[PDB]
Design an enzyme around this catalytic site. Structure first.
Site, PDB file in Angstrom:
ATOM      1  N   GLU A 296       0.834  -1.347   0.064  1.00  0.00           N
ATOM      2  CA  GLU A 296       0.077   0.008   0.072  1.00  0.00           C
ATOM      3  C   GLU A 296       0.886   1.132   0.040  1.00  0.00           C
ATOM      4  O   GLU A 296       0.741   2.299  -0.749  1.00  0.00           O
ATOM      5  CB  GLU A 296      -0.861   0.016   1.114  1.00  0.00           C
ATOM      6  CG  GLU A 296      -2.009  -0.928   1.085  1.00  0.00           C
ATOM      7  CD  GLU A 296      -2.899  -1.187   2.294  1.00  0.00           C
ATOM      8  OE1 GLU A 296      -3.699  -0.376   2.321  1.00  0.00           O
ATOM      9  OE2 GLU A 296      -2.533  -1.881   3.262  1.00  0.00           O
TER      10      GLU A 296
ATOM     11  N   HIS B 267       1.999   2.367  -3.452  1.00  0.00           N
ATOM     12  CA  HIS B 267       1.056   2.999  -4.099  1.00  0.00           C
ATOM     13  C   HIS B 267       1.120   4.560  -3.865  1.00  0.00           C
ATOM     14  O   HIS B 267       0.875   5.368  -4.817  1.00  0.00           O
ATOM     15  CB  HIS B 267      -0.652   2.382  -3.927  1.00  0.00           C
ATOM     16  CG  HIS B 267      -0.735   1.101  -4.736  1.00  0.00           C
ATOM     17  ND1 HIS B 267      -0.361   1.029  -6.120  1.00  0.00           N
ATOM     18  CD2 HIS B 267      -0.794  -0.205  -4.413  1.00  0.00           C
ATOM     19  CE1 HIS B 267      -0.555  -0.202  -6.257  1.00  0.00           C
ATOM     20  NE2 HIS B 267      -0.780  -1.062  -5.570  1.00  0.00           N
TER      21      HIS B 267
HETATM   22 ZN   LIG Z   1      -1.700  -2.877  -5.606  1.00  0.00          ZN
END
Ligand SMILES: [Zn+2]
Ligand SMILES: [Ca+2]
Ligand SMILES: [Zn+2]
Length: 157
Positions: free
Chosen positions: A113, A116
Site C-alpha cells: 500500500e 501505491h
Molecule cells: Zn496494488
C-alpha cells in the site's frame, strides 16, 4: 501527481485488537525506513494534527464504493495521493493479520500500500513486492526494479 515536499508524516487512527500496537508500529515504521533507507525522503509520526498519510482499520462496508466481500477480493486499498481523503489507507480488519509467515504478513501488505502512495505501479517481476499475487519471501527487502523506479522519480539518497 506526486508529493512536492521532500518530507511526509503519518498517523494511525487506532490499532486493531488482532495484534498489539507495539508490534504494528514497528511493522509500519520498518516499512517507512525501508523506503527512506533508499530515498532522501523522511517520515515523521505525529500524535496530533492531520497527517499526509492517515492509516486506519475498517470492517465490511465503511462509506466507500469498494466494500469488502468476505475474505475474498482485495485485502486492502488506498486513495490516490491527494488532499481530502487522498493518501489515506484502509485495511480489511475482517481478515486475520499476523507478523510472520502465517496466513498473511501485515508488513508485506503495508509496504505494498505504501508503494501505491508513492505513485509506484504493479510489475511482472516476481522479486518485486508490488507483485499482484501474494508470495512469501524469506526476508522482506526492496527490489532493484523498485529502487531504480523510486530513485528515478526523486534520485539517489
Ligand atoms: Zn496494488
Ligand atoms: Ca477481503
Ligand atoms: Zn476504504
Amino acid at each position: 501527481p506526486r508529493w512536492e515536499q521532500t518530507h511526509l508524516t503519518y498517523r494511525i487512527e487506532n490499532y486493531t485488537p488482532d495484534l498489539p500496537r507495539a508490534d504494528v508500529d514497528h511493522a509500519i515504521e520498518k516499512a517507512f525506513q525501508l523506503w527512506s533507507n533508499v530515498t532522501p525522503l523522511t517520515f515523521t509520526k505525529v500524535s496530533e494534527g492531520q497527517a499526509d498519510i492517515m492509516i486506519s482499520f475498517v470492517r465490511g462496508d465503511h462509506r466507500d464504493n469498494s466494500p469488502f466481500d468476505g475474505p475474498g477480493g482485495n485485502l486492502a486499498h488506498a486513495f490516490q495521493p491527494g488532499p481530502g481523503i487522498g493518501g489515506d489507507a484502509h485495511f480489511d480488519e475482517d481478515e486475520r493479520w499476523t507478523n510472520n509467515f502465517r496466513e498473511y504478513n501485515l508488513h508485506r501488505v503495508a509496504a505494498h500500500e505504501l508503494g501505491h502512495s508513492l505513485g509506484l505501479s504493479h510489475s511482472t517481476d516476481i522479486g518485486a513486492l508490488m507483485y499482484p499475487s501474494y508470495t512469501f519471501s524469506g526476508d522482506v527487502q526492496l527490489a532493484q526494479d523498485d529502487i531504480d523506479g523510486i530513485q528515478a522519480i526523486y534520485g539517489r539518497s
